[PDB]
Structures are given as C-alpha cells and as structure tokens.
Design a protein around this ligand. Structure first.
Ligand SMILES: C[C@@H]1CC[C@@]2(OC1)O[C@H]1[C@@H](O)[C@H]3[C@@H]4CC[C@H]5C[C@@H](O[C@@H]6O[C@H](CO)[C@H](O[C@@H]7O[C@H](CO)[C@@H](O)[C@H](O[C@@H]8OC[C@@H](O)[C@H](O)[C@H]8O)[C@H]7O[C@@H]7O[C@H](CO)[C@H](O)[C@H](O[C@@H]8O[C@H](CO)[C@@H](O)[C@H](O)[C@H]8O)[C@H]7O)[C@H](O)[C@H]6O)[C@H](O)C[C@]5(C)[C@H]4CC[C@]3(C)[C@H]1[C@@H]2C
Ligand SMILES: C[C@@H]1CC[C@@]2(OC1)O[C@H]1[C@@H](O)[C@H]3[C@@H]4CC[C@H]5C[C@@H](O[C@@H]6O[C@H](CO)[C@H](O[C@@H]7O[C@H](CO)[C@@H](O)[C@H](O[C@@H]8OC[C@@H](O)[C@H](O)[C@H]8O)[C@H]7O[C@@H]7O[C@H](CO)[C@H](O)[C@H](O[C@@H]8O[C@H](CO)[C@@H](O)[C@H](O)[C@H]8O)[C@H]7O)[C@H](O)[C@H]6O)[C@H](O)C[C@]5(C)[C@H]4CC[C@]3(C)[C@H]1[C@@H]2C
Ligand SMILES: C[C@@H]1CC[C@@]2(OC1)O[C@H]1[C@@H](O)[C@H]3[C@@H]4CC[C@H]5C[C@@H](O[C@@H]6O[C@H](CO)[C@H](O[C@@H]7O[C@H](CO)[C@@H](O)[C@H](O[C@@H]8OC[C@@H](O)[C@H](O)[C@H]8O)[C@H]7O[C@@H]7O[C@H](CO)[C@H](O)[C@H](O[C@@H]8O[C@H](CO)[C@@H](O)[C@H](O)[C@H]8O)[C@H]7O)[C@H](O)[C@H]6O)[C@H](O)C[C@]5(C)[C@H]4CC[C@]3(C)[C@H]1[C@@H]2C
Ligand SMILES: CCCCCCCC/C=C\CCCCCCCC(=O)O[C@@H](COC(=O)CCCCCCCCCCCCCCC)COP(=O)([O-])OCC[N+](C)(C)C
Ligand SMILES: CCCCCCCC/C=C\CCCCCCCC(=O)O[C@@H](COC(=O)CCCCCCCCCCCCCCC)COP(=O)([O-])OCC[N+](C)(C)C
Ligand SMILES: CCCCCCCC/C=C\CCCCCCCC(=O)O[C@@H](COC(=O)CCCCCCCCCCCCCCC)COP(=O)([O-])OCC[N+](C)(C)C
Ligand SMILES: CCCCCCCC/C=C\CCCCCCCC(=O)O[C@@H](COC(=O)CCCCCCCCCCCCCCC)COP(=O)([O-])OCC[N+](C)(C)C
Ligand SMILES: CCCCCCCC/C=C\CCCCCCCC(=O)O[C@@H](COC(=O)CCCCCCCCCCCCCCC)COP(=O)([O-])OCC[N+](C)(C)C
Ligand SMILES: CC(C)CCC[C@@H](C)[C@H]1CC[C@H]2[C@@H]3CC=C4C[C@@H](O)CC[C@]4(C)[C@H]3CC[C@]12C
Ligand SMILES: CC(C)CCC[C@@H](C)[C@H]1CC[C@H]2[C@@H]3CC=C4C[C@@H](O)CC[C@]4(C)[C@H]3CC[C@]12C
Ligand SMILES: *[C@@H]1O[C@H](CO)[C@@H](O)[C@H](O)[C@H]1NC(C)=O
Ligand SMILES: *[C@@H]1O[C@H](CO)[C@@H](O)[C@H](O)[C@H]1NC(C)=O
Ligand SMILES: [K+]
Ligand SMILES: [K+]
Ligand SMILES: [K+]
Lengths: 207, 271, 271, 86
C-alpha cells in the first residue's frame, strides 16, 4: 500500500524475499529514501511504475533477482547517485534501454546471470559498459546471450566495437545536408545530361 | 557482429528528400516566371512522340519497368518497413536502382519537351517520379531501406490501354473505354491499399509507433474491396487514427468517383 | 484542499435553463397573439440587411465567432463532460462568454427586426441561440461546466456559402449550389456526431450513468461516416439505449434526406 | 534460461523431478550433450520446442513421466543414436 512503511523515517535496511510479491503501488516508499539496502528478490514482480524508486536517495545496493520482469523502464529507476551495486540475475530481461546506465554515476557491481539476453544493437551500450567495467572471468563465462537464428554460443563479453559498427549513430549536419541535397542535385544532373545530349545531337545534325 | 535492428526511424529523411525536391523546384519555377533551345525542345518532343517508333518502344519499356517495380514492391512488402541492408550484397536493390535511374532519365527527357514547365510539374507522372526516385538514392546512400511510397508506380497502370492501342490489339472505342475504366479502377484500388498498408503497419508517429497492426498488403487489398462494396465485415479494419482518417477520405472519394463514373458505365451498358 | 470531483450531475439545470426560455416565451407570444415602433423596426431591419455594409461585416463577424466557438468546443471535448472550474482563473471560458453575449445581442437585434415574432422564434438560428446562450450564463453562475449542446453552432456553417457570395468569390449558380450542398452535409454530419458523442459518453440517465462508453468526438465522426455510407464495420457502435435510438433516427433521416437531395445531385452532374 | 547449466560440460547425470517445470526455452542445454541420464518427470510441461534435445548426443535414457504433453513433435526429439530407453 502507499506509505506502507510510514513512521520508519530512519530505516536503513529493508529485506523482502521469498514473499511472492506481485504488485507494488507507485510512491509506496514515501519517506523511505534513507534506506541503503533493498532486497526485493524471489518475488513475482512483472512491471514497475515510474517514480517508484524516486523517493529513495541514499540507496546503495539494489537486488531484483528471481522475478518476472521483462522490460525495465529508465524512468522507474531514475537517477540514484549513491547507488553502487545492482542485480538483475535470474529474470526475463531481453534488452536494456540506452542511457539507463548513464543516469547514475556508480554502477561498479552488476549481475546479469541467467537473463535471456538477445544480443543486438540494443545491447551495445551494455557491451560498451563491459569494455569500461570488465566483469570477473567466472561471471563473464556464466553470463551469455541468445543469438537469433542459430546457437547461443556467443558470450556477452566477446563482442567488440566491430559489432557496434553496424549500429547507425544519429546523423550529423553533413549526412543531413547530403540526404537533403541528393534529390534536387540528381534531378539537375539528369536534366543537364539530357540537354547536353540534345545539344550535341543538334550540332552533329546541323553539320 | 552480424545483426539487424530497427534502431531509430528515418522515414522523415526519405519523405523530406522528395518534399524539398518538389516544393523547392516549384518555387524555383514560380520565381523564374516572376523574373538552340527551340531546336533541342523540338528534338525532345519528337523523341517522346507517340507517332515515331522510338516513342512507342520507349513507353512500352517504361510500362514494363513500372510493372517490374510493382512486382519488386509486392515482394518486398513481406519485410519489416525499415531495415538495414548492404547494397553490394543484394542485387534486387541494384535492379530497382537501374529501374529508377531509367525513370529519372525519362523524366528529364519529358521535362525538356514541355511547353509549360509549371503544368508539367503538377502531372501525376511527375509527382510519382518525385515521390519514387529520390528515396532509392537516399536508401543507397544511407545503406538502409524504407518501404515508403513505392506502390505509387501502380498509378502508371492507367496508360495500359494506350499500350494496347498502338500494338493493333484494340480497335473499337468501346473496348478501349472498358479497358481504360478497368485499369483506372485497378490502379486506384492498388494505391489505396498501399497507403492503408503503410499507415497501418507503420503506426502512429506521435505515439512512438506503438499502434502498429500486423496487416499484410493483400489483407489491406481485401479490406479495400470489402469497404468499396459497402459490405464491411469488420474482421479487419484500420485501428490507427491516421488509418481511420485515410479510410474516411477513401470512402468519400470512392463514392464521389463512382457517382461521377456512373454515366460512362451506362454508356458501356448501352441499349 | 485543491481537488476536482464530479459529485452530482447537474445537466438537468442547464437543459431546463433553455427549455423554460424557449417554451415559456413561445407561450407568452401565443398569449399576446390571443390578447415609434415602426421607426425602430425599420432601423433594426436596415441594420441587419445584407445590402448595407454593416450587415455584411456583422454576418461575417458572427460566422467567424461561430467558427471560434466550434473550435472551443472541439478543444473542450477532450475533457470530462461535467467538471468544476474557476471563471476568473481560466480565460477560455471568458472568450466563450464574450462570444455568447455577442450572439445574444445579435439575437435581440434580429428579434426587433421581425415582422412575425412567432415564425422567427421557430428558426434554427433562434433555437441554437436558445440552446447555446443560457447554458454559459448558468455555468458561470454555478461555477461549474457541462459540455451540453455546444456543437449546435456548427449548424451556422450552412451560411458559409452566403459568406462567399458578397465577397466576390462565387459568381455562378452551380458553384454556389455545390458549396451549399457541401456545407449542409458537413454541418449535419458534425452535429449528428455531436449528439452521438454526448449521448454515448454521458450514459443512460435511468441507470445511474453506468453505461458510459469512452468515445472521443472524432471516433463518433468516424462512426457517423461509416454508418452513412452503409458500411457498418462494427468496431465502434452505440451501446446505450438512447444512443441506439438516436442512431436509428439518424439512419432514417439521412436516408430520407439523401433520397430528397438526389435530384440536386443529378442537376449538378448535368449532361 | 538458455545456457542454464553452463560450465558443466562434463556433466553425466541430471535429475529434475517434483519441481513443477512449466516452460523450458529452446537451446537451454547448450553444451550439455554429454549427459546420459535426463529425468524431467513430475512436472507440468505441455509443449517442447524443436531442437531442444538437439545438442544432446550421448543421452541414453530419457524420462518424461507425469507431464501434460499432448503432441510430441518428431523435430523436438531429433535423432539420438545413443538413446536406449524412453
Ligand atoms: C524484363 C522486364 C522488366 C521487369 C521484369 O520482367 C519484365 O524483370 C524480371 C526480373 O528482373 C525479375 C527479378 C529477378 C531477380 C529476382 C531475385 C529473387 O531473389 C533471390 O531469391 C533467391 C531464392 O533462392 C535467393 O534468395 C535467398 O534464398 C535463400 C534460400 O535459398 C535464403 O536463405 C536467403 O535469405 C535469400 O536471400 C535473399 O536475397 C539476399 C541475398 O543475400 C538477402 O539475403 C535477402 O535478405 C534475401 O531475401 C537470392 O539470394 C535472391 O536474390 C527475387 O525473389 C525475385 C527477383 C527480384 C525477380 C522479381 C521479378 C522480376 C523483377 C521480373 C519483372 C517482371
Ligand atoms: C478572431 C476570430 C475569432 C475566433 C478565433 O480566431 C478568429 O479566435 C482565436 C482565439 O481566440 C483562439 C484561442 C485563444 C486562447 C487559447 C488558449 C489555449 O489554452 C492555453 O494553453 C496554454 C498551453 O501552454 C496554457 O495551458 C496550460 O498548459 C500547461 C502546460 O504548459 C498545463 O499544465 C495547464 O494545465 C494548461 O492550463 C489550461 O488552462 C487553464 C489554466 O489555468 C486550466 O489549468 C486548464 O485546466 C488547462 O487546460 C494556458 O493556460 C491555456 O489557457 C487553448 O488551448 C486554445 C485557445 C482557447 C484558442 C483557440 C482558438 C481561438 C478561439 C481562435 C479562433 C479561430
Ligand atoms: C434511401 C434510398 C436511396 C436510393 C433511392 O431509394 C431510396 O432513392 C430513390 C430516389 O432518390 C429516386 C430518384 C428520384 C428522382 C427521380 C427523377 C426522375 O426524373 C423525372 O422524370 C420526369 C419525367 O417526366 C421529369 O421529366 C421532365 O419532363 C418534362 C415534360 O413533362 C420535360 O421538360 C423533361 O423531359 C423533364 O424536365 C424529370 O426528368 C424528373 O422529374 C428519374 O426518372 C428517376 C429519379 C432520378 C429516381 C431514381 C431512383 C431513385 C434514385 C431511388 C433510389 C432507389
Ligand atoms: C491474382 C493476384 C492475387 C493474389 C495473389 C496471392 C496473394 C496472397 C497470397 C500470399 C499471401 C498470404 O496468404 O500470406 C499471408 C497473408 O494472407 C493473406 O494475404 C490473406 C488475405 C488475402 C486477400 C485476397 C488476395 C487478393 C484479392 C484480389 C486482388 C486482385 C488484384 C497468410 O496469412 P495467415 O497465414 O492467415 O497469417
Ligand atoms: C481535418 C480534420 C480531421 C481531424 C483532425 C484530428 C482529429 C483526430 C486526432 C486527434 C484525436 C486522437 O487521435 O486522439 C484519440 C482519439 O482517436 C481518434 O480520434 C481516432 C479516430 C479518428 C477518426 C477520423 C478523424 C476525423 C474524420 C474526418 C473528419 C472531417 C471533418 C487517440 O485514440 P487512441 O490512442 O486510439 O485511444
Ligand atoms: C478506392 C479508394 C478511394 C480512391 C478515391 C479517393 C480519392 C480521390 C478524390 C479525388 C478524385 C479525383 C479528382 C480529379 C478527377 O480526375 O476527377 C474525376 C472524378 O472526380 C470528381 O469528379 C471529383 C471528386 C472529388 C472528391 C473529393 C473528396 C474530398 C475528401 C473526373 O471525372 P471525369 O470522368 O473526368 O468527369
Ligand atoms: C427535434 C428534431 C426536429 C427534426 C425536424 C426539424 C425540421 C426543421 C424545419 O423544417 O425547419 C423549418 C422551420 O423550423 C422548425 O420547424 C424548427 C423546429 C424546431 C423543433 C425544436 C424541438 C425542441 C425540443 C425540446 C425551416 O427552418 P429555417 O430556419 O427556415 O431553415
Ligand atoms: C447525417 C445524420 C442524420 C441527419 C438527418 C437526420 C434527421 C433529420 C430529419 C428531418 C430532415 C429535415 C426536414 C426538413 C427539411 O428541411 O426537409 C428537407 C428534406 O427533408 C425531407 O424531405 C423530409 C425528411 C423527413 C425525415 C423524417 C425522419 C423521421 C424519423 C427539404 O428538402 P428540399 O430540398 O427543400 O426538398
Ligand atoms: C499524395 C502524396 C504524393 C503526398 C501526400 C503525403 C503523404 C503520402 C504522407 C504525408 C504524411 C505521411 C505519414 C507521416 C508519418 C508516418 C509515420 C512513419 O512511420 C512513416 C509513415 C507515415 C504514416 C507517413 C506516410 C506517408 C504520409 C501519409
Ligand atoms: C433539438 C434540440 C435543440 C432539442 C432536443 C432535446 C435533446 C437534445 C435532449 C432531450 C433529452 C436530453 C438527454 C436527457 C438525459 C441525458 C443524461 C445526462 O447525462 C445529460 C445528457 C442526456 C443524454 C441528454 C442529452 C440531450 C437530450 C437528448
Ligand atoms: C550490496 O549490499 C548487500 C546487502 O547486504 C550485500 O549483500 C552485497 O554484497 C553488496 N554488494 C557489494 C558488491 O558489496
Ligand atoms: C535408464 O536409466 C535410468 C536412470 O537411472 C534408470 O533408472 C533406468 O532403469 C534405465 N533403464 C533401463 C531400461 O535400464
Ligand atoms: K450497403
Ligand atoms: K457491415
Ligand atoms: K453494409
């Protein structure tokens, strides 16, 4: 319920696992931002309303293991500068929205073991974060991803910038100018070529 | 490393590549109006004239290439609307590129042989060239592909009856009129189905394309046929806002066109 | 403290504020019939005459304000039907109030220039004034707002063709007749959609308004267009009893009106 | 999950019964073909994706007792020459 833990303004630790939670209302942690550890593992959570973790400010390590989450909205997590560790292992997450990791400064510890990650352009920010923050070798071996159309033998950390080269970055002013000018320039070139051919044929005939 | 993803939608670039051709060159023509040429104009006029052999074979060629482009669009309609591909790897895109550069050369040859440039610029053939040819150049430059307005080449089916006339297949006026009516109806049916399919599978733009409905092209053809006969089963219908607006406009236009074409139908029935 | 709630429905007060104007003053006129005026009548007649400049600019002004009121209703149709608001806080209500007091002044000026008061009282402009102007005064007095019959101002679109005629835009009779038919069709389409939207989103009164269906105005416009073309997809339809009764009446009236207007369509088609 | 038993390439026995399994993703036994005994009994499995047992090659005895399977697709089982009991 909203304001479920009201009166515990100085709470620091909060653990809720093996409870089978299935629905958490938005703004249910009003005044609970003081906590630093939050365990919501071993539940049946599927969707998180945006702004649920917004009142939390001093939270450091967050766990969401063993849940039914499919899409993790960046608005739900928000910006938590004091966060240090986050866990999403044993879930049903397929891809992460770009820029979600860039909202918060410190994401030193991350666990993504067992998620059905479908490697793709979307996962490229996560792969870049792996390049910046290398995982432990055992965790790198355990965490894998699904390659559509064939075997899932490709490790998540084995990808490099060559895979990122396929992704189309937002176009700059040069590409915008070129795609704006391709049409009229091509039409003028065609008109000039036809006019030159006609003038040359007229000159040859008049000779 | 090999992967395909939609990423960010780039339809606006393809659409602008035709808008900043059409409207900008129309403004250029208007401003020029406010502010050996005869020989080359006569040469281009006799080049595309229907009397000579060159004009006949050339209009037959452009009709055949329009048929080929329509077949290519029919094949490619079974794919995601926006997708990345390699121009060198696939040669169907090369075939479409050759077809479209031939269309561009024909458009230039027509534009030279034009007494009035402004009224030539508002023809249906000119506007289908504008909304077909720059998109393939933009696609091959950006190494991506968008389905776009490539069904509009079906509007070149209207000349089909003329294609018969100078091949000694149609002589009487009644058969020519019947074939013209059938070709016009088929072409407008196909292009209306094309717009409906594009606007339904693309989704609403202001709602982040979350209203996309998995409708094939032939399902949209079936929907248009059911609608135009005033049956309306309701098994398939447009769910997007823009799709519903297009359906309303198509209903009004089809009713008006049928009411206008009733006397020709009566004349074909005769006494 | 700041909160908004529906509370109890007050639609009956707004409706009675127009009924006890219309019917009561009609009875007053009838009883007066059972039981410098010429100078002021002539002055009011020449004031609103279409020949003079004042009448022309004044009818253009009232048409423009009717367009503005229709736009205001279109904007406000995306809100709950009955809602509380502050008159001083919002200035769109002030704009509507100014428009409606101008309409009231125009109605009074028309009523002075009336040879037969009773037949003037039964005109469509008089009845749209009766069902539009008292509700805004009741709304500003009660500090609440109800959507009501504010779409009926679209019935002034029938004058649109006349608005062109004395601005040197239409000269021939055929174009004037075509514009008149188009304006009549558009106005009746919009007002039928307005009634359908009101009766659908309001719900059944005798069932405590538990039959309300979340239908937008444009969805009702789409429903009316689908119905009047005898297509009937069935994706959207009236679920309330009063809505279904209104749909049946609209179907019958539209069929009768189309059957009556067929000869004018044939004359416009011509030979 | 796909690659659930990753790292156990030399696994020979695998028993999963009384667990109430209801959904097994395709290619979840990547690298588990070495096993010989596979017990998936006492569960609520209904449909099996084709190629699920394709990475398995040394499997000998397979058990699917006490499940909710209705149609057994031949593509799901594939060709297992070393299988002996089912
Ligand atoms: C002369 C006048 C002018 C007009 C016209 O005649 C009259 O010209 C004619 C001619 O010009 C025709 C075209 C010729 C070329 C044709 C090419 C054909 O595609 C080819 O289809 C093949 C089918 O075996 C291969 O496709 C691959 O097939 C594999 C399985 O066998 C897949 O795996 C793989 O994916 C496919 O590969 C396909 O092609 C690429 C190859 O890498 C990509 O992988 C792409 O994804 C995929 O889909 C091949 O690779 C692919 O190219 C396409 O189906 C129809 C096509 C275009 C034709 C359409 C009709 C035409 C226009 C005719 C038209 C009437
Ligand atoms: C000259 C002839 C006559 C007829 C005509 O031209 C020809 O006259 C023209 C002119 O008269 C036009 C009107 C002018 C005044 C306009 C007002 C405008 O509303 C304004 O829209 C603004 C948008 O930024 C503000 O709205 C707030 O926007 C905030 C976010 O920025 C919200 O938060 C808040 O809620 C909104 O606030 C809105 O307004 C209130 C402000 O307190 C309430 O909060 C209300 O709830 C809310 O919705 C502002 O506050 C609100 O007022 C409305 O959208 C259209 C409007 C009415 C116009 C409609 C079309 C016209 C009639 C034209 C018409 C053709
Ligand atoms: C809800 C549904 C909609 C559809 C429909 O049903 C209801 O609507 C019905 C209705 O709309 C019908 C039409 C109503 C109007 C009809 C008009 C009628 O023409 C009449 O024919 C007369 C013949 O004498 C007049 O002819 C004049 O005669 C003069 C001499 O007397 C001459 O001058 C000159 O000839 C004419 O002048 C004049 O020519 C015209 O008065 C025509 O012959 C059939 C007609 C068009 C009807 C055809 C069938 C309909 C469309 C019906 C149709 C099924
Ligand atoms: C002769 C040329 C006509 C047709 C040539 C063949 C075109 C359709 C067949 C291939 C497409 C197809 O069935 O795939 C899928 C789409 O399903 C449909 O397309 C079903 C709707 C068909 C509408 C009627 C066809 C055109 C009408 C007349 C047009 C005249 C011009 C299968 O759908 P699913 O499996 O249900 O999912
Ligand atoms: C040009 C003026 C026409 C139109 C101007 C724009 C009006 C509609 C767009 C805004 C409303 C809108 O989409 O919001 C919601 C309502 O959804 C609809 O309105 C969908 C139904 C549209 C019917 C066709 C429009 C009018 C037909 C022709 C009328 C001609 C007069 C979105 O719905 P959702 O997200 O599905 O929930
Ligand atoms: C099927 C799907 C919907 C397709 C149609 C939708 C849309 C097409 C709408 C325009 C039709 C073509 C106009 C120009 C034209 O050639 O007019 C022709 C008819 O047309 C008319 O007589 C005018 C029709 C006006 C319709 C206005 C609809 C406004 C919404 C001239 O006819 P004619 O024999 O020269 O006399
Ligand atoms: C109600 C639905 C009525 C449907 C038919 C309307 C016919 C109107 C009609 O012929 O108008 C005529 C008379 O004008 C009248 O006779 C106006 C009748 C007003 C009825 C008001 C009912 C209020 C109920 C509570 C002519 O109107 P005009 O302004 O000369 O055009
Ligand atoms: C679209 C949604 C439904 C809207 C319509 C629904 C409803 C409007 C119904 C009344 C139509 C107008 C009557 C008065 C009038 O101007 O008649 C006109 C036609 O009209 C007729 O000829 C009479 C039509 C009678 C319809 C009776 C319906 C009873 C239920 C006179 O026509 P004329 O050219 O002067 O001859
Ligand atoms: C008559 C022709 C040549 C010009 C008219 C312009 C038409 C064809 C244009 C104008 C607005 C366009 C739409 C605008 C937005 C989107 C969303 C995106 O997913 C691409 C398709 C779609 C749905 C466009 C389809 C084409 C469109 C309807
Ligand atoms: C022709 C006009 C001017 C006069 C005819 C009166 C009509 C418009 C009146 C009479 C009865 C009225 C309805 C009576 C009851 C309700 C329930 C309430 O939620 C308000 C709307 C609604 C649904 C009214 C809508 C308007 C209504 C249909
Ligand atoms: C985060 O805090 C939790 C709560 O006790 C702890 O179990 C976990 O080890 C911490 N993570 C790291 C990386 O220190
Ligand atoms: C197959 O192997 C299982 C695994 O223990 C065993 O229980 C069973 O008896 C074996 N079947 C046969 C026929 O040997
Ligand atoms: K019908
Ligand atoms: K129907
Ligand atoms: K029907």
């Amino acid at each position: 319920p909203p304001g479920a833990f009201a009166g515990a303004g100085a709470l620091q630790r909060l653990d809720l696992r093996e409870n089978g939670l299935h629905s958490v209302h938005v703004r249910a942690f009003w005044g609970l931002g003081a906590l630093q550890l939050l365990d919501l593992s071993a539940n049946q959570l599927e969707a998180l309303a945006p702004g649920t973790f917004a009142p939390l400010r001093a939270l450091r390590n967050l766990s969401l293991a063993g849940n039914r989450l499919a899409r993790l909205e960046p608005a739900a997590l928000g910006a938590l500068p004091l966060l240090r560790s986050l866990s999403l292992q044993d879930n049903e997450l397929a891809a992460l929205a770009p820029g979600l990791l860039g909202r918060l400064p410190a994401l030193d510890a991350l666990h993504l073991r067992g998620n059905p990650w479908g490697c793709g352009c979307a996962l490229r920010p996560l792969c870049a974060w792996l390049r910046r923050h290398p995982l432990p070798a055992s965790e790198a071996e355990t965490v894998l991803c699904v390659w559509p159309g064939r075997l899932t033998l490709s490790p998540l950390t084995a990808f490099s910038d060559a895979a990122f080269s396929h992704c189309a970055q937002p176009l700059a002013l040069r590409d915008l100018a070129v795609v704006y000018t391709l049409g009229p320039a091509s039409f003028l070139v065609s008109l000039a070529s036809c006019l030159a051919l006609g003038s040359g044929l007229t000159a040859c005939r008049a000779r | 490393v090999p992967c395909d993803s939609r990423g960010q939608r780039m339809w606006w670039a393809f659409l602008a590549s035709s808008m900043v051709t059409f409207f900008g060159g129309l403004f250029i023509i208007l401003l020029w109006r406010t502010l050996w040429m005869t020989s080359v104009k006569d040469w281009a006029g006799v080049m595309i004239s229907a009397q000579t052999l060159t004009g006949r074979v050339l209009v037959v060629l452009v009709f055949a290439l329009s048929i080929g482009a329509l077949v290519i669009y029919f094949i490619d309609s079974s794919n995601p609307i926006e997708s990345c591909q390699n121009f060198y790897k696939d040669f169907t895109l090369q075939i479409d590129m050759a077809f479209n550069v031939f269309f561009l050369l024909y458009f230039g040859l027509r534009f030279i042989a034009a007494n009035d440039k402004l009224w030539f610029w508002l023809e249906v053939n000119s506007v289908v060239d504008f909304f077909t040819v720059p998109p393939v150049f933009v696609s091959v430059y950006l190494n991506r592909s968008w389905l776009g307005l490539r069904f509009l080449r079906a509007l070149r089916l209207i000349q089909f009856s003329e294609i018969l006339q100078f091949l000694n297949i149609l002589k009487t006026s009644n058969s020519i009129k019947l074939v013209n009516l059938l070709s016009i109806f088929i072409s407008t049916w196909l292009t209306a189905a094309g717009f409906i399919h594009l606007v339904e599978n693309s989704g609403d733009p202001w709602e982040n394309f979350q209203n996309n409905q998995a409708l094939t092209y032939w399902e949209c053809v079936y929907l248009l046929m059911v609608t135009m006969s005033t049956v309306g089963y309701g098994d398939v219908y447009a769910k997007t806002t823009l799709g519903r607006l297009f359906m309303v406009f198509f209903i009004l236009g089809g009713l008006a066109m049928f009411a206008s074409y009733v006397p020709e139908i009566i004349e074909l029935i005769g006494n």
